[PDB]
Amino acid sequence: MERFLLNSTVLLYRLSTVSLDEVSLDERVESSVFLAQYEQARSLPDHVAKSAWSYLVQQIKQRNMKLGPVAILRLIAEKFIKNEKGGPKIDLPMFSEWQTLMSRVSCLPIIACHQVFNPGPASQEYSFRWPLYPYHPTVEDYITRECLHETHQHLNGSTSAEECWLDALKHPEACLRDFEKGWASQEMKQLCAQIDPSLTPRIFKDRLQIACNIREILCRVAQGVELPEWIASMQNPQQLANSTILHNGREYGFATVWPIDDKYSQESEFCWLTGLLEKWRFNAPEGLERLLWIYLLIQNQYLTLLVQRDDMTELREETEKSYLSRFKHAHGAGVYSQVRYLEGRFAPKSDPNKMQKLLFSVLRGYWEYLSAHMSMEWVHEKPLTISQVLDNLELVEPHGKCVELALVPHFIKRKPKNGEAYPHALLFKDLKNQAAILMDMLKSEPRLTGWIRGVDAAANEMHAPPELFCPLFRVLAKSGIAHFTYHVGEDFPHLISGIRSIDDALRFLPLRNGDRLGHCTAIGITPSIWKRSLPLSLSMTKETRLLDLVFIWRELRSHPELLRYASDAAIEAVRLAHKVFSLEEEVSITTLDQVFEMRGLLAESEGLSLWLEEYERARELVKTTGMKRPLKLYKQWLTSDNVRKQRAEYVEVALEYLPDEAVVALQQAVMAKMADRNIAIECPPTSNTRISQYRNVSEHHIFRWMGLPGEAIEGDVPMSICLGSDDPGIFAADLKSEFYHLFVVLTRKFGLSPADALRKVAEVNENGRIYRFHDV
Amino acid sequence: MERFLLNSTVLLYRLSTVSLDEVSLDERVESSVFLAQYEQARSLPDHVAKSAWSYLVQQIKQRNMKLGPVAILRLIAEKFIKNEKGGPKIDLPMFSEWQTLMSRVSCLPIIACHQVFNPGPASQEYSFRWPLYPYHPTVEDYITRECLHETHQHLNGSTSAEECWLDALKHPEACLRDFEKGWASQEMKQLCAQIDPSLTPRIFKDRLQIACNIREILCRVAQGVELPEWIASMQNPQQLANSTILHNGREYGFATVWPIDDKYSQESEFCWLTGLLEKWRFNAPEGLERLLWIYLLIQNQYLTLLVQRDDMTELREETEKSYLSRFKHAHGAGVYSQVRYLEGRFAPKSDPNKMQKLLFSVLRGYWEYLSAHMSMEWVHEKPLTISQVLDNLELVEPHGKCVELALVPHFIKRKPKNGEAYPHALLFKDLKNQAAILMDMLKSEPRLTGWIRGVDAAANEMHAPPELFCPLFRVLAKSGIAHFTYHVGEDFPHLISGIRSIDDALRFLPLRNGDRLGHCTAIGITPSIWKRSLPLSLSMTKETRLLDLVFIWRELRSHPELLRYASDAAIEAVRLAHKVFSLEEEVSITTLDQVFEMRGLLAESEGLSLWLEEYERARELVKTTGMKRPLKLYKQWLTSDNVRKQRAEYVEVALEYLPDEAVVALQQAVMAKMADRNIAIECPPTSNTRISQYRNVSEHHIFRWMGLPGEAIEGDVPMSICLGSDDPGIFAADLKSEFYHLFVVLTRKFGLSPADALRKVAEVNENGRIYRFHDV
Amino acid sequence: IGITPSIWKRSLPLSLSMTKETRLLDLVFIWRELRSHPELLRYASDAAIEAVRLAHKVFSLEEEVSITTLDQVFEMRGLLAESEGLSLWLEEYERARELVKTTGMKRPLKLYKQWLTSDNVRKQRAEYVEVALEYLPDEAVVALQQAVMAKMADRNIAIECPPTSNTRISQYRNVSEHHIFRWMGLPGEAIEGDVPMSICLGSDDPGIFAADLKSEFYHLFVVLTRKFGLSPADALRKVAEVNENGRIYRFHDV
Questions:
Q1: Out of B564, B567, B584, whose CB is closest to C107?
Q2: Do B51 and A540 touch (CB under 8 A)?
């Protein structure tokens, strides 16, 4: 019930619109908790929620406290945080629930409450920058010996959501413009309405202003200075939405003086809350206590909005400082970095000048991190340019006590616009342009090949198929990129479609030995779990259905137990192809296979500088053999309006079109291809629950990949799995947190020994070192 | 997506507040569908919903239709309803999905659309009164041979929700007063807010008035008469909330003339919709099409509100007509009744005059049903009183071709008020009073014992424990009731608590051979399913925790594999009893058991006409033995304010306090006691999903009770299970529908032969005849 | 928890002497661990019954005391004596005092007060009783050892093993009989049901004139390779695991 109190749109609305004169809101807060509980967790029974609320109220009453943010934070701090040899830690049994709580509530008020009421031993100096972790001697010993390796680290944005919230307070206008820019899209409107139906940019401005004003008022309370007496006119919380209070006809401001020069820093945020909670140890004024409650609710709702949206001026506000903070966060506390190999992902920019500034800022921040930790001779104390930064960076030797940085830009796929010859034309031109700036820069600075180590494509799978990036990747390979990773968007209309998508990526993309694929959930999730809460029939496009049909026939045409399914797939695929192509001749399943074999060829090459050489190479390889009828069919597949109209048409496919054994066989066939090609998998953090079929962390497919008994299916081919913390789905997270989360689940729910659990997690962690993109 | 279009608060709000001049609302309806889908079914992935909506829009476009109620009803009718030998039926594979749809959408518009666009063979006469059923020759043959038996039929209210909706239109004021009377309670406010946050009695009045006005306007359209030209002033749907339209300064009414004298009857409802859909076969006006959409949305939301709320003037509006319709509905179509033994449940009234009128109306309606179907000599053609009704009814012989009626009033438990000596004093006095009128009537008409065959208690389990009704049942037994059934409310804070509740009912209640218990889900649901979507720790009162602790020790003190759990339960129960009783002596677990053995004794008897004889009988049985220390402890348990305060206090209990094997052992121990005492179980309909842990019908615990492989657990003791359709949870339902639903699930999901599936369902059905309360 | 009952009984009298305090505490411990063991319900029931009878003598009380009440009194042993009778030291004082008064029982608290501050109770506690050597069979004692093994592993507490060259045990007639090899999981040495534990190398009192941690490392390797017939790689792996437990469970600041 604590998470509902600290995160509820209904409670925030009922607290931000009601005047502070009222003091007895227990009934209405209770109603808010029940409404939030039903909205967020409907599967929870009503009587269980009522009993939990009754226990919570009794617990507060027995502690001589009052229902509010202070009491709730105190109960959470005792429930989760205790003091150990390394400072404040999280109980190993309680870490899984803590991660679930971190998806809804920010931890900074909780740790501040813990410091106030349960201080560390001997009053030793303590600083809260990194998220809290549990402690196990085996895990700490392994981390100190073998540092953690990150394969997917988005360098854009901030390390966590909480300092993003402070950034929003620091620059309300910049975040407001970004919010409105996203809000114009319909997806953001739906997402905001899901979180809060009564959410508008006007209300967003009001809530941001109210939270900032509450911060200033409570800063005066926490600092110890007396209130400036305009609080008498302060009766309604909505008066803080305009950044000025009218008292006796005078316009009074809200900002005050802060001891730290950075009033929006993490340390200022922690110090303010610790002081405010210390002064409210025994009692608090009701109006100001509600003000703290409103601030926490506004902050938590903003953090939820940010994390769900994640998966110019604002960028220039931090620039190299954000990257420097990222590398310090990856380093962690102590002289020795907890992370050795870190692969940074950044969004490519079509502007060459913006690109040069972007990589200069990232590389300069990396040099700043190295110079702060390592004291050595530098060629340029103030490089101010990429060339001098590389001059300083080339003096650094691989020693393992610091973070080793590899840069992998991730191309962003977009929606396929109507017409425009082949379906993905404008998107391909944009990606080709972005590659062009990347290539001309690499030839303009050959030393950048030692830092620009890979190319990624992570937007979504429906918008662009894997065969789109094949000419892009092949031409980029000749530019010295030397590594390629492709994100398989796991929003497949059918499980077979996702398995086909991974197979298509292996078939067409030029993934060499040691390459990686991103988020291969389709071959990881079992059919039984995937079918949870799904309609008995599923909808997908004719193009996707036809491709899945050919894939099913190819994999299963020999399986004696599954010759039903392959023969049926081949027959009905031929019948579907007759509708899609509108052809009148006879087409066998073999001919359909050949047409889909040449999918990787460029559209212009199919119709027929590094780019041109790839053009005739694909063109000649389509003409060496004596068949042009499949080539003609592929031309009709690409550049026929009737075919495109048929392709975009949706068909109705049953949920259990193939039995679970058949789908598992397809997954294992792709497993064999994945292992034979030696391609690693960047597993998402297990705390990220966008799958929506996993009702607990123990049901995650990584444990099936780990070969756990009960989880692994007979016939599964072992694969290389890496740890990638790109979108953790929780406010405060780290690669260490994911490492501990996997260890905790293995030890507790699966009942593994600490050594055995460490061995399995270490194997996954070391796969990020074996399959790293860093230059050797 | 069809269910979201026909049932969505967001869509209804966006359609009832926007003027009819707008014609292109496809984008905003699409947004409404996504918001409703996320709110109702969040576990469904976003991309799946988008693909389904795209297919639905394409399906409508390819049919040359327009997005609206007409097209949606057409698609549903073809998707579910087809014509067979018995008329319009439901596909056997599609019946499970149809039942799920019936929980959200009324079927009457769907069947009307089916009749319009897919008429029956040879244009044969067809009447829609009963809900649609699937057809299987084995099931029909069994029903004709062995009629269905109902053990739980609430005679109050109407047969289904749909004619309740027409009753609301018939008497808007009566339903408005009932709605406001419920709305004063906080539970109704929470329930209405969950269904619709912006729902108030003022809005409820507006929506009822709008729906009635839409019905009148579309009645003129369906009848063929031209609109009376005030539609020009009709631009905004909210103008129908005041039952009068201002056109050119004149107050024009909405009511029109209907061909049938009963404008609010089912036949009038069906005929109106069939005519309106027939006149809109090819095209419909946009404004009136939206009006039909708004009417369907309002009706569906009201039906959802009614079914969730279910589990004076309005009663007098129907009176004996409702009971007569109930018996005709139970009889079904054909000369021979599909139901033979029907046990009617009615709410007892504290007013003797109201009670006499209530039973007179029910019995007279039963005589009307018998006289309509059977032509024979009657002593009184117009009895007008109970005595003459029984004079007519005693001439009817048991022949099996008609419905045999047994009356079982169900006592309603209430909240325990504070203080008042023993915890349940005012409730016990109210129940004792209600029993008093029942008893004096039975002695005033001894022939009523052949119709008043049982006594029930079905409100909830937390509000009143089973031991409350023990003096009530024992005294009622001496009055000639001869049967007793007790409803075990399945909102237990813990699974052990529910198992203890069933055990307490068997231990204390005077359930003789052939008696039944209602809704024994606690011993039916497996621990694995029950733990779904539950917090790691659960909250319950100290009284409930202590009783569960003693129960665990009693059952498991000998189990060699479970001597951990019994010894731990006994030790910590003794420690808990020290806190609750605040005693300073030494209390063993045996002494605690003895104190809880005497729970069934009356509170006044514990402190120490048919009622008095029970008083000294319990008093003397507590004094025959030489122990009064457990008696003294029970006195402190009943009449000590400190003990009551401790009892109402809540404790924190882990979810996995006992392993699944231990909980299953407790369930099987109660299974053995249930079978040894030969007590049947009235199973709820499987279409009623208030369990919230069952994500599909195949996961229901009735199949575990049926002994199905995979579902039944080793060591389970077979029990007698009866079919009781009290709260089906769907708008249109019947005992036949539940029979078909069980047969469909057994044949399809469990892969049983039609003969084998029929045998299992027949065994459950015939248990309602073996354990019937009817006089032999 | 390392030495097997068979080796420990070597060269011991058929009956052993211990104080009434120690005997009573062992009796409660036996009942707590074995009250569920179906093969050992003799020993737990006998321990509980005779513990209650012993407590009657020690406390000289006349009321009825169950084994559960005795358990509660010995649960509060960790509380401070002054706190039981009722700066960093004071905060611990009321913390133990309040935790003894949150619950509604003071009769076990009163019994613990008599256990601490009653001259008759102390005189009874210092009195010695006669206990047979084979009071519990080797299976029962091994079960107690494995129960503590499970608690040791669940709490993740390491064991600082003494050097094997230190023969103050007096029941080990050769180094190959040392209990560290049972902890190492060696065949023949490890008993069925043993819970693996973390064992560290600690050279505090080697028992020989010239010794080192290297000498103990070589001694374990030599015994594993020769007397137990293990491969040099296998023997090194087992000794390395024990050696690296001193790094995983080290007290040094990280």
A1: B584
A2: yes
